Design an enzyme around this catalytic site. Sequence first.
Site, PDB file in Angstrom:
ATOM      1  N   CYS A  35       0.915  -1.151   0.000  1.00  0.00           N
ATOM      2  CA  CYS A  35       0.000   0.000   0.000  1.00  0.00           C
ATOM      3  C   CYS A  35       0.955   1.202   0.000  1.00  0.00           C
ATOM      4  CB  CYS A  35      -0.897   0.010   1.243  1.00  0.00           C
ATOM      5  SG  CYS A  35      -2.052  -1.434   1.490  1.00  0.00           S
ATOM      6  N   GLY A  36       0.510   2.385  -0.421  1.00  0.00           N
ATOM      7  CA  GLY A  36       1.472   3.482  -0.506  1.00  0.00           C
ATOM      8  C   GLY A  36       1.005   4.905  -0.705  1.00  0.00           C
TER       9      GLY A  36
END
Length: 153
Positions: A35-36
């Site tokens: 995720c980011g």
Amino acid sequence: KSIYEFQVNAADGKPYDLSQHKGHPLLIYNVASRCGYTKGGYETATTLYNKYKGQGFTVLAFPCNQFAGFACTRFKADFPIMAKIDVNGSKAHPLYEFMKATIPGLFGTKAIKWNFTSFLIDRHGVPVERFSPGASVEDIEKKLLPLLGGARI
Ligand SMILES: [N+]
């Protein structure tokens, strides 16, 4: 000493041609593999890559699952994503040991602390600048625009 004395795999898992970027500035980011927060660092990276690629510039993303403290939809970008590496510890990539040793987070050990930390590399492949994830586009341009001609002539 330059980044071009290190070897690295690309996302497809095979050796990446790093030296194609020699004689042009380059930014290298560590990004989460999973995720980011695709706001912030990601938009600076993409902005700079689009504003400046035309003149030899690129951004390189090194996925690293070392600051998630198996999630979302896997990192995607228009610039070159590399094979996941560690950037700190007994298995860090010597490329990262080189850049972190050349420019430390003052103390912090020199250790990479955040995702979307970047290093600016000159035409010779020497790290000349270390940016925090919250550095703006402009803040990166102050150091980068005198490199898109090399630092000469
Ligand atoms: N890599």
